[PDB]
Design an enzyme around this catalytic site. Structure first.
Site, PDB file in Angstrom:
ATOM      1  N   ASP A  45       0.840  -1.089  -0.108  1.00 43.31           N
ATOM      2  CA  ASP A  45       0.080  -0.120  -0.008  1.00 43.31           C
ATOM      3  C   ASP A  45       0.991   1.161   0.089  1.00 43.31           C
ATOM      4  O   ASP A  45       2.044   1.122   0.165  1.00 43.31           O
ATOM      5  CB  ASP A  45      -0.992   0.073   1.150  1.00 43.31           C
ATOM      6  CG  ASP A  45      -0.393   0.633   2.316  1.00 43.31           C
ATOM      7  OD1 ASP A  45       0.929   0.421   2.711  1.00 43.31           O
ATOM      8  OD2 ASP A  45      -1.133   1.261   3.167  1.00 43.31           O
ATOM      9  N   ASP A  49       1.374   5.150   1.760  1.00 37.30           N
ATOM     10  CA  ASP A  49       0.839   5.808   3.199  1.00 37.30           C
ATOM     11  C   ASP A  49       1.279   7.309   2.910  1.00 37.30           C
ATOM     12  O   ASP A  49       2.520   7.505   2.631  1.00 37.30           O
ATOM     13  CB  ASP A  49       1.644   5.200   4.387  1.00 37.30           C
ATOM     14  CG  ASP A  49       1.280   3.649   4.520  1.00 37.30           C
ATOM     15  OD1 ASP A  49       0.056   3.519   4.995  1.00 37.30           O
ATOM     16  OD2 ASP A  49       2.117   3.017   4.365  1.00 37.30           O
ATOM     17  N   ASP A  85      -3.304   4.842   2.510  1.00 32.26           N
ATOM     18  CA  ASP A  85      -3.682   5.552   3.581  1.00 32.26           C
ATOM     19  C   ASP A  85      -3.410   6.871   3.640  1.00 32.26           C
ATOM     20  O   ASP A  85      -2.294   7.457   3.349  1.00 32.26           O
ATOM     21  CB  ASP A  85      -3.044   4.802   4.654  1.00 32.26           C
ATOM     22  CG  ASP A  85      -3.355   3.172   4.881  1.00 32.26           C
ATOM     23  OD1 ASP A  85      -4.551   2.802   4.554  1.00 32.26           O
ATOM     24  OD2 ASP A  85      -2.724   2.600   5.480  1.00 32.26           O
TER      25      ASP A  85
HETATM   26 MN   LIG Z   1      -0.962   1.401   5.230  1.00 31.20          MN
HETATM   27 MN   LIG Z   2       2.497   0.611   4.008  1.00 28.08          MN
END
Ligand SMILES: [Mn+2]
Ligand SMILES: [Mn+2]
Ligand SMILES: [Mn+2]
Ligand SMILES: [Mn+2]
Ligand SMILES: [Mn+2]
Ligand SMILES: [Mn+2]
Ligand code: NA
Length: 327
Positions: A194, A196, A251
């Site tokens: 992912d 961030d 995120d």
């Molecule tokens: Mn994350």
């Molecule tokens: Mn991450």
DNA sequence: CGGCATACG
DNA sequence: CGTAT
DNA sequence: GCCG
């Protein structure tokens, strides 16, 4: 020679004991699937110790005096050094329980407790879950629909494009607001699961209400495949690809500039590094650390920090750049 | 033996 | 319950 | 599972 806490030693992303650490991390993961957080932690810490060594472990005697290596972790290493394989690790790898708990917990929206219950109900595959969608949350339905894309590594190349997109929406939501890349990519990883981002504004208080405004603008641009006042948003972004696109977990986190060093430190990780840092702070220094601040419970005061460097100094630790926090 | 990081959605 | 490092 |  080797300090006991991971925050007391540099841990680079790549190191000299990759196979040994990966084996111990299998046992850590399996412990977690059985609810044994204590065993998970010891195996994680033992793995991280090896990541921090300056050369390969070739003989069992080299483990003597290393923190977090007792009978069990030493025997794992011994078997790998002698036979190239550890029977316990291999038995875990091929167990139906491990493979299924790994498959289920990798779903966005599914934790250990949910995966365990599904396993006890006899479920084993993703299609088993798709057959009975009435039992799934909206978050789990999203995680299941996008599971294939979300299992594909995010590349550094993807990150730059996403950052530009987020900054455009952030600049409209609040001129002057900034976007900082955090997480594994800030530690130097070339791939990740992912992306961030940490968002703030140089004028304390101006960041209030910011995340809803950012999300509304991203959603209006058609870039949000899934998302939930708030300060953390766990989204699935539509990322353009050659002639198409792919879903990517992103995120977004907002902090006031007064808290930015603490939030940057927390969100840059690694997870083990931050747990060890907070453990060290509390147990060795009597200070309470989180992603908002650092609290002295005797004086009942919060430490002001202008930088990560400030925080390491507060805690009596030598500074570690993000690339050496890969515990 | 007790502890194991500490939050937000 | 989930999520995050 | 290991530490203090
Ligand atoms: Mn994350
Ligand atoms: Mn991450
Ligand atoms: Mn043998
Ligand atoms: Mn907050
Ligand atoms: Mn005990
Ligand atoms: Mn993570
Ligand atoms: Na999950």
């Amino acid at each position: 020679w080797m300090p006991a806490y991971a925050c007391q030693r540099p841990t680079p992303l790549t190191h000299h004991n990759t196979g040994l650490s990966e084996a111990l991390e299998i046992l850590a993961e399996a412990a977690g699937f059985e609810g044994s957080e204590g065993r998970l932690l010891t195996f994680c810490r033992a793995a991280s110790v090896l990541k921090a060594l300056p050369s390969p472990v070739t003989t069992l005697s080299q483990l003597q005096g290393l923190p977090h290596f007792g009978e069990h972790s030493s025997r794992v290493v011994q078997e790998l050094l002698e036979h190239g394989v550890c029977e316990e690790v291999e038995r875990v790898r091929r167990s139906e329980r491990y493979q299924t708990m790994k498959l289920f917990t990798q779903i966005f929206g599914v934790g250990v407790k949910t995966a365990d219950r599904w396993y006890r109900e006899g479920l084993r595959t993703l299609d088993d879950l798709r057959e009975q969608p009435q039992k799934l949350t909206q978050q789990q339905k999203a995680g299941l629909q996008h599971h294939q894309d979300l299992s594909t590594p995010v590349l550094r190349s993807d990150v730059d494009a996403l950052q530009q997109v987020v900054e455009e929406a952030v600049g409209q939501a609040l001129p002057g607001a900034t976007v900082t890349l955090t997480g594994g990519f800030r530690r130097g990883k070339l791939q990740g699961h992912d992306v961030d981002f940490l968002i703030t504004h140089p004028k304390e208080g101006q960041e209030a209400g910011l995340l809803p405004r950012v999300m509304c603008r991203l959603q209006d641009q058609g870039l949000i495949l899934y998302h939930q006042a708030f300060e953390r948003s766990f989204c699935i972004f539509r990322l353009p690809q050659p002639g198409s696109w792919k879903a990517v977990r992103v995120d977004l986190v907002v902090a006031p500039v007064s808290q930015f060093p603490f939030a940057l430190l927390g969100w840059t990780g690694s997870k083990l590094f931050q747990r060890e840092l907070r453990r060290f702070s509390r147990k060795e220094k009597g200070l309470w650390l989180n992603s908002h601040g650092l609290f002295d419970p005797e004086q009942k005061t919060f430490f002001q920090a202008a930088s990560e460097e400030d925080i390491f100094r507060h805690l009596g630790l030598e500074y570690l750049p993000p690339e050496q926090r890969n515990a």
